[PDB]
């Protein structure tokens, strides 16, 4: 059976935005008020959130901002699965909120963490939402040399003893742009300052290959003109390669009918670097936001060349016309919803490929009538063993993410606050519940999932907290592969 093995408190001081939702014009224009609750522009929970948990050998690395509203420091915690002990590092940087307005919480601005399995360096990317040298902070700090925020460690830092797991392991900014003695934020990953390359970036997400190569991808640009860029860590050189575009910017002048933006995620799946995404075209049409569903994979271990669509055909690279990578048109799921903005696709998209080559993609497609969602359609698109017909069904529960281990795919979530796992054989839509925490166990408000070596690492926010400091836990659940 799937079994809970460990439950570990991470902190009682995780930052939470305990105020109310603010519009973007509100967030940009309103001044701070002392004693205010911590308002927010998007979500209210920045911890656990983003690419915030990784497992390397016997270490679980977890990031979070610390509360409350006057603190907001970037934190890195390492739990040792062999000793049961944890150690945390406080970084000088504090969450800068919405475009420098640090009293408005900004859940885009996560802290991503990765370990290089080659040289055991630690990498952190944090507090970014497409900032640039001329981002207007409204009088809240100088961002001209701080629009891209990277911290990294000495080689070997991942495995030092707890008492040595300190800021001493991390490398200061000693460039000509350095702020001084506690500046751990680097404006580049390549050793070369490059505003074209490192501005307008959002959503840091690392992934690793079988052989221990480490990669990063981010979104560059805007919701009207956006691309995914990705690079590779060069352990032998102590730096990263130049960002490479999966798709172009300015597609409207390079072969597509119009510029577009890309909503998806690259992952390492069944031994290959791949991407699944949806497109936002911003045409005045039936699509309030995103349209389509797309997927491509690379047969190149570096992920740079040999990109193909699900049929195995080479695609243009960098991609200009998303339809080369088409798998499904979610507008089809509401075939009579033809009025302006009547098909609303704003989230709920995910994908995976199992170790047997089964391709799986999920989506949420909403019907939008008089400015309200009146129908929610969940889809599951899947191809057994990478061949044959692509099956799409709407007989799928309200799940927003898919995971994989062994021959299976998994839905993992919270039901009445308690973690559950549903499992299906890859290449199928036949889920059964195989784990549900028992009555009397704790209740959680939010969790992020990391699958590693046949185990589920569930990084969880405990429900029922008050104020801007809350309690997070780590659960380690054996998937019994
Ligand atoms: Ca700096
Ligand atoms: Ca549109
Ligand atoms: Ca097999």
Could you explain how this protein is built, in words?
The protein is an all-beta fold. The protein has a domain at about 250-440. It has helices spanning about 25-30, 195-200, and strands at about 5-15, 40, 55, 60-65, 75-80, 85-95, 105, 110-115, 120-125, 130, 150, 200-210, 215-220, 225-235, 240, 245, 260-270, 270-280, 290-300, 305-310, 325-330, 345, 350-355, 360-370, 370-385, 390-395, 405, 410-415, 420-425, 430-435, 445-450, 455-460, 470-480. The strands form eight sheets. Strands 10, 12, 13, 14, 15 and 16 form a six-stranded antiparallel β-sheet that branches. Strands 17, 18, 19, 20 and 21 form a five-stranded antiparallel β-sheet that branches. Strands 22, 23, 24, 25 and 26 form a five-stranded antiparallel β-sheet that branches. A hairpin with a 2-residue loop joins strand 31 and strand 32 (about 455-460). It is globular and about 60 Å long. The termini are close together. Bound molecules: calcium ion (3 copies). One calcium ion binds next to loops. GO terms for molecular function: metal ion binding. Keywords: Calcium, Metal-binding, Signal.
């Amino acid at each position: 059976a799937i079994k809970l093995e460990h439950e570990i408190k991470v902190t009682d001081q995780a930052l939470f935005f305990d105020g109310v939702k603010k519009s973007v014009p509100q967030a940009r224009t309103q001044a701070y008020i002392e004693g205010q609750k911590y308002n927010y522009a998007y979500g209210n929970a920045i911890a656990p959130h983003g690419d915030a948990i990784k497992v390397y050998k016997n270490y679980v690395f977890m990031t979070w901002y610390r509360g409350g509203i006057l603190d907001r420091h970037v934190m890195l915690t390492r739990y040792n699965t062999l000793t049961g002990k944890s150690v945390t590092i406080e970084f000088p940087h504090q969450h800068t909120g919405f475009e420098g307005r640090w009293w408005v919480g900004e859940t885009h601005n996560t802290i991503a963490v990765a370990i290089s399995p080659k040289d055991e360096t630690i990498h952190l990317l944090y507090d970014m939402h497409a900032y640039r040298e001329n981002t207007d902070t409204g009088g809240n700090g100088d961002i001209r040399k701080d629009y891209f925020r990277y911290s990294y460690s000495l080689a070997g830092a991942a495995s030092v003893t707890d008492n040595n797991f300190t800021l001493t392991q991390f490398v200061k900014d000693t460039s000509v742009n350095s702020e001084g003695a506690t500046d751990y934020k680097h404006l580049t990953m390549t050793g070369i300052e490059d505003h074209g390359q490192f501005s307008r970036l959002t959503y840091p997400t690392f992934f690793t290959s079988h052989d221990g190569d480490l990669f990063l991808h981010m979104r560059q640009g805007s919701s009207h003109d956006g691309r995914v860029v990705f690079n590779k860590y060069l352990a032998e050189q102590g730096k990263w390669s130049h960002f490479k575009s999966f798709n172009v910017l300015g597609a409207g002048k390079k072969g597509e009918i119009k510029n577009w933006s890309i909503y998806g995620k690259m992952k390492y799946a069944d031994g290959k670097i791949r991407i699944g995404f949806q497109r936002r075209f911003n045409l005045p049409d039936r699509f309030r936001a995103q349209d389509g569903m797309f997927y491509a994979y690379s047969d190149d271990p570096s992920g740079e060349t040999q990109w193909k669509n699900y049929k195995g055909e080479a695609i243009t690279m960098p991609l200009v016309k998303a339809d080369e990578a088409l798998v499904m048109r979610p507008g089809d799921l509401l075939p009579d919803a033809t009025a302006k903005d009547q098909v609303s696709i704003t989230g709920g998209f995910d994908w995976t490929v199992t170790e047997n080559g089964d391709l799986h993609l999920i989506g949420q497609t909403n019907e939008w009538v008089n400015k309200k969602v009146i129908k929610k359609v969940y889809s599951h698109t899947y191809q057994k063993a990478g061949v044959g017909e692509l099956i799409t069904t709407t007989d799928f529960p309200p799940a927003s993410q898919l995971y994989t281990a062994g021959e299976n795919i998994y839905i993992i979530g919270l039901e009445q606050g308690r973690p559950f796992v549903e499992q299906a054989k890859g290449g199928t839509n036949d889920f059964t519940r195989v784990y549900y925490a028992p009555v009397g166990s704790q209740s959680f408000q939010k969790g992020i999932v990391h699958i590693h070596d046949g185990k589920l690492y569930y990084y969880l926010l405990e429900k029922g907290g008050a104020g801007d400091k809350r309690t997070t836990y780590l659960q380690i659940i054996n998937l019994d592969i």
